[PDB]
Amino acid sequence: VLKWIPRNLPSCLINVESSVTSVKLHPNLPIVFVATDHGKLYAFDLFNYTIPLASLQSHTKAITSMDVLFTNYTNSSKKNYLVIVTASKDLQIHVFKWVSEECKFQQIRSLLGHEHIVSAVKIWQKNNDVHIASCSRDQTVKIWDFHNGWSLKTFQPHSQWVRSIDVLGDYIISGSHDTTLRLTHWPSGNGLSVGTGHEFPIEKVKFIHFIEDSPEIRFRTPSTDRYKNWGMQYCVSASRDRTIKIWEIPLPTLMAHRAPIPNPTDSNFRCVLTLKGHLSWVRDISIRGQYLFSCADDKSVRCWDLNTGQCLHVWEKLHTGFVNCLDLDVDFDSNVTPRQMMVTGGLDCKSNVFMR
Amino acid sequence: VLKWIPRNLPSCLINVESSVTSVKLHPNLPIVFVATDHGKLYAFDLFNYTIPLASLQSHTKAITSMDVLFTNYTNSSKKNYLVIVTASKDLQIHVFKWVSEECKFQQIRSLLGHEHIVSAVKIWQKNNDVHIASCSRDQTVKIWDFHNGWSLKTFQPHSQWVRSIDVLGDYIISGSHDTTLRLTHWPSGNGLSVGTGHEFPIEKVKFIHFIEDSPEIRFRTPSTDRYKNWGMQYCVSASRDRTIKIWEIPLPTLMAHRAPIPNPTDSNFRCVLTLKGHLSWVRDISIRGQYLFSCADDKSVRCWDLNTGQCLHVWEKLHTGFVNCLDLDVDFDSNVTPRQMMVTGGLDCKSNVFMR
Amino acid sequence: TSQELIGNCIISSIYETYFGHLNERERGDMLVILKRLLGKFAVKYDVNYRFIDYLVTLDEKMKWLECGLDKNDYFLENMSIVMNSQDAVPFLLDPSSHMITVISNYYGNKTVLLSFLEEGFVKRLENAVRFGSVVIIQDGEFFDPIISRLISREFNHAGNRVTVEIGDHEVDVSGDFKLFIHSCDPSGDIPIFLRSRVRLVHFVTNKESIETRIFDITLTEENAEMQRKREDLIKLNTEYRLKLKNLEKRLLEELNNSENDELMVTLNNLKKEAMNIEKKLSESEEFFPQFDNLVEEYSIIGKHSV
Amino acid sequence: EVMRPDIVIPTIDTIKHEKIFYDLLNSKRGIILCGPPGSGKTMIMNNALRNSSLYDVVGINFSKDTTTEHILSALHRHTNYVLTLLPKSDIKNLVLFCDEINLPKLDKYGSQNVVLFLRQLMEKQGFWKTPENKWVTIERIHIVGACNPPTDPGRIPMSERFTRHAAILYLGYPSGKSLSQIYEIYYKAIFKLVPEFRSYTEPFARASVHLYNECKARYSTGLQSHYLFSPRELTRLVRGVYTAINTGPRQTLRSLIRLWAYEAWRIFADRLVGVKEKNSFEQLLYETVDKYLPNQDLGNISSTSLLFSGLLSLDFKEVNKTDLVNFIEERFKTFCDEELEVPMVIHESMVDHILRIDRALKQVQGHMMLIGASRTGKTILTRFVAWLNGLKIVQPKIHRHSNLSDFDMILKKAISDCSLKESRTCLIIDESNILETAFLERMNTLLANADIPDLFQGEEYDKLLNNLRNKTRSLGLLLDTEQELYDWFVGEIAKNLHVVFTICDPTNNKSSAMISSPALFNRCIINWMGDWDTKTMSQVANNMVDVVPMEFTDFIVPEVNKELVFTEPIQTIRDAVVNILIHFDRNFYQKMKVGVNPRSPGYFIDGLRALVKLVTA
Ligand SMILES: Nc1ncnc2c1ncn2[C@@H]1O[C@H](COP(=O)(O)OP(=O)(O)O)[C@@H](O)[C@H]1O
Ligand SMILES: Nc1ncnc2c1ncn2[C@@H]1O[C@H](COP(=O)(O)OP(=O)(O)O)[C@@H](O)[C@H]1O
Ligand SMILES: [Mg+2]
């Protein structure tokens, strides 16, 4: 049931007035959130895609990135709801709340502190505490507390401006415009290791989480007890050199009840598998099950296999122009149901949805 | 799917600085265009109608009517864009291009040559050619190229001032101050048949295309094979008689690869059904699905059926004055999706919008 | 007047850029060439067109005259060309170097003088462009390529602020900043990179300008009353047009709705102003050919002078 | 193998000259070579010396600023002092290579010093040492030379007192048969990649030879001073065809002919100036294709219609015009968002030039010069193509109050960044950035050779060797000798440094001297931006006036002559405005007596912007 593949044609077509930048899926009901380039933020119904549910103009420039998380709170006093943040080129990030009863956007608050444009934002929950992390052109990979609304730890991991980040537990890796990758410990801020090997600016980099039950996986199954106790084994990258590389994140000098320490002899990333075949810059990637879903600026979205390492299927000429971002459902989390859908967003002001 | 009646309460109540003359809808985005009496053209979006997106001075006298079509070029050399054309009493036929990225109007060209008040303008697209048809009160129907700007063919089809224009296929019906409405081909410009049966000027006439698979439609099904091969059977006409007449075009002497000739015995249309039970002047009639929609001057709008031909829902107290215009989405073309939202005009400096 | 808007507007725009570095003779020749070209392709234009009468309004004309500019028409045209270039920085070429006082009067105390032969030049220049004060540069024939970004306007939009790189460190700018370049040597060598990117304007005195200044002098000395009458009637016509517009606005605001004594008095004032405008036009119709008679009278002296 | 610069093709002429060269060099006689700049004297010299077991090779390249210290340093690496000077090898004799003997300059009193040093070495059979004043004996070291005739602008004739002691040979251009055989071998080697077209080796070689002969016979030096065609251009054409086929798709015959035509267009006619000269070139291409490659179903061979790109795919192949234009549009939008923003309008000529500069930049040791009027979009195009290929722009911020110190420190920092830090850099050179001839000869040293030895001396040389050793140990390479580190360093520099030259006014004396420099003309591809033709101006004007309301009056179509309409045939008032502006610009530049100087089109753009703003208001 985890080996689902979208069919050769889109299930439905979604029209937006401007260039589509970021697309996200509601993890409980088939609702597609679409960001624009004119500054609008949209929302659509999958079964009724004729007109949007609601729209809201919160930023004076384009929205660069967006993610969706459905919170889970142990206490019964708090009510479970949805959080949307849209990082935008107008120096600010905003927080929205989805209203199920009214089907209308309601802005919660807004954060500030970046000295240039923000390019990627990620959200996660550790234990009944929601944290928002963002990276910008001022190289300040910042973090935030959702309840407090104040900055916690600001650090600069790179000389050139960072572009994309990903977060899991207390560990954050970040691609950058200096064609290098680097892990940074989220609470402390020490750079555990660095990665080199690309020849072009980094577009999107995200983790490769663990999975419980699978027949065989050669890129997610942990190897030894050290990896089992750590939790992070491999990471994947996508840069503008038309290549997707799967890396091995090195072990640090870890100590119990102590901050991780870098290894002088093992603080360098290790390239494991390379991929090629995309005709332009790999804009965004997504991992679900054992299949690597990625796009490019070649008007196409390609499907890759983790184990054998070649493109099983190709969706050529999916858009008239460039393809911007993809999305799947999170499979490593039991709270989120990994439904059989995948949605793309193009630069030609059209959004396509693949279902069943 | 094609039978979604709007609700009693209108979704949006758009405020306009002056009285509304004509309203057209964007065929891909939820943006409504409002034409005023002063000549202002407003760019209103539905989800936040307090502020206009754009407002330019098209003409200086009263704008009569307008049409909006989305261009579809089969060649990748030209990028598709919206085209808005307006007509007024200023002897001018302005053509505007709406750019969605900058959300502002942009005048392309204006067409000149008429000698009196221009009443109606309709757009229709060929495989790679775009044409503009217009008529003045000087009993002259013209043909305008979209890019060349010249006048291709002109003729005089009536002895009185004309106020209704429709162009679907290669024919045209023009209703004058006299009841006389006639069909003239474009390559020849010769009248075929004359309509009579109204005691007042005819305001608006539009054809009826061939609908797709429908359960029990009555005025859209092809009757004879020759009529189906011709491709157009029925018509709907307005009047100031507080009634609507659905007509029937007799077949002309069609010969292959030549301009056809009229029939002397069949030089008169047939009256199929009369739409009685109305209370004022009927301004605009547009057709979609099983339900025929019309607008009353007496502070109301009435939508009646097509199969049985009587009331189901009557909308009252929408506007305190004279309702001027409405726009059903065209469900007859495969290039446009027939979404579920309605918009109506009036003389009370307001326009009501229905959604779903 | 709307049938000729496209023809009259293109002549003004083409005059601002191409004809900055020419004297009267080839300016008239190229204007004749342009009029022939416009008549060839059937684009209508005003036969009685004057650049001063089309761009230089009365208020800015009096403002330029009181600042210290000479009353010559050529200098007025060049002044209008210089201070109507929002995108391209103008270049000033005047041997007399009188116009520095003119720009100082125009901008008041905000005028700050800088020279390329200085040593603390770059620091004061970046401080001034951070503040946004107007900067006037002397000795432009020794161009310093450190301000090539300012000449080319190759800023980048870093955030919500306009950002430029000058010298070796980042500096910020603001919209109030304007730059001027003044030069003294007519034969001073100029780099092509600056020459093709700036509005080169020649403030010199040539033989055709000698003839024009002599005609101006003999006109203002032999018949001063007629020149004063022409200036007075032009100023009176401008004032009458402004008063007519103001009275029309008041009359429309008072009588468009729905009369009283105020509306009747406004209508009487409008009638009187219209009659005065008609009388002024009738009087001016019999005064223009006198200037043609004068220029047919005082041209042999110009030929002798040249 | 054709990429390697040591590969030669033995024909009758080269083996005959090798035999007589061995006869002369065995005769204890001085040897001087003198031929045209395309004769390949260095090629035959290297082939003769490096493949003989009786003689060795020493690396000396004369320049305008050369003293005997360079000769002493070069001889010290191969010879020894016993006081008799003896080479290290006791069997093979030493041949002193001296290319461009005409290149060193005369002194303040009408004489040259290093040529008299060579005269003393090959006449007095030794020399006098300067610091200890001791006589030196030389027994088996001969001296060879190879220089152009001094009639060209830049070679200073040496006195007869030197040439009396050395034999002189003339190496003219090889005839048609020798070129045909050499490029027959080259085309068989290149067609070994794709065996499906091996039978077409002879027509390709014949077409290339005939095209080169016709291009040399048609365009001469009298029309333009930089029309110095040579067989080196044919070699570069073959290298371009190889680097195109190697990174290309499945290859057909029509695509082969299109690839050859595109390579000929970008190697032979990119330096042309006149429009009628380009028309003659395209007529030559049509005639050559008709004569030697009778193939049907062949499309247009215009410059715009020959678009080969590596951007749109993983391989070098022809791409459609509209897709390429859209890709360039979106990439330029992203570039101006990330970097400095300029209101640039897209036209087909800039697409052609951006593809040709992208082709030029990807080549190993690829350098080129841009010749065009000001405000024709050269620096911005170079920055755009450098950002597209991941290069790093090092723009020399050179002001009037600058000297050689800033130039050498900028070059040293650039070289260190290119080699030590392993980052490819695209260096631009402006006309205003070269004040005196010292910068010109520094660029000559950097381009003609692989590095600048003057930058690294003494403690600088020692720390350079230390840094090279540190980097070599970092990469784990077994290199210990200083020669291995040094030539690996110059190989890395030649692999990771592409320089371009921006020239505004070629008629000027400094630009004429720079383009007449023999060390920069041969090694750099000559790209002629030139002036805008009428079609480019029409496209720019049409794309700039579309944003404004223009048709608001009744317009009657004016019937004018065919040659007076440069825009597509007139139908609207916009075409009338565009044609009027173009006609005015042509008449204005005709009546300002600009001569053959390039016309800057910035007036047109400024006039269009002022026009649209004023008509909007
Ligand atoms: N006999 C030959 N065999 C192979 N290539 C040749 C031959 N003669 C000339 N060439 C080509 O001509 C070019 C001459 O280059 P070069 O030796 O630098 O000229 P020069 O010695 O005059 O500076 C070389 O690139 C070489 O490939
Ligand atoms: N269509 C065009 N093509 C080339 N340059 C243009 C065009 N339109 C405007 N420009 C101007 O050209 C300038 C860039 O040219 P650049 O390469 O810097 O000239 P140069 O090579 O003389 O330095 C820009 O500042 C821009 O204003
Ligand atoms: Mg040579």
Author numbering:
A (entry chain C), B (entry chain B): 139 to 494
C (entry chain A): 3316 to 3573, 3579 to 3626
D (entry chain A): 2384 to 2465, 2471 to 3005
Original authors' sentences:
Cytoplasmic dynein-1 (dynein) is a highly conserved molecular motor that moves toward the microtubule minus end, transporting various cargoes including RNAs, membrane vesicles, and viruses, and plays a crucial role in cell division. Dynein belongs to the ATPase associated with various cellular activities (AAA+) family of proteins. Its heavy chain features a motor domain composed of six AAA+ modules, a long stalk, a microtubule-binding domain (MTBD) located at the end of the stalk, a buttress region that makes additional connections between the AAA5 module and the stalk, and a long tail that interacts with dynactin and an activating adapter. Lis1 is a dimer (~90 kDa) with an amino-terminal dimerization domain and carboxy-terminal β-propellers that bind to the dynein motor domain24,25. Our data support a model in which Lis1 relieves dynein autoinhibition by increasing its basal ATP hydrolysis rate and promoting conformations compatible with complex assembly and motility.
We also prepared grids with samples that were pre-incubated with Lis1 before ATP addition. Because some of our maps showed partial density for the Lis1 β-propellers, we performed 3D classifications without alignment in Relion to further resolve this compositional heterogeneity. This analysis distinguished states with no, one, or two Lis1 β-propellers bound to dynein. The nucleotide occupancies in these new maps correspond to the nucleotides observed in pre-3D classification maps. In addition, the interaction sites between Lis1 and dynein in our maps are those previously characterized and are largely the same in the bent and intermediate dynein states. We also saw clear density for the second Lis1 β-propeller in the intermediate state dynein, even though the nucleotide densities in this state are consistent with the ones in the straight linker dynein. Comparison of this state (I6, 3.4-Å resolution) with our straight linker dynein (I3, 4-Å resolution) bound to one Lis1 β-propeller showed that the sitering interactions are conserved while sitestalk is shifted away from Lis1 as dynein goes from the intermediate to the straight linker state (~15 Å), making it inaccessible for binding by the second Lis1 β-propeller. Binding of Lis1 at the second site is unlikely to happen without Lis1 bound at sitering. We next investigated the AAA3 and AAA4 contact area and showed that Lis1 binding loosens the AAA3 and AAA4 interface, potentially favoring ADP release from the AAA3 binding pocket. Notably, binding of the second Lis1 β-propeller further loosens the interface, as illustrated by comparing the population distributions of interm-2× Lis1 versus interm-1× Lis1 systems.
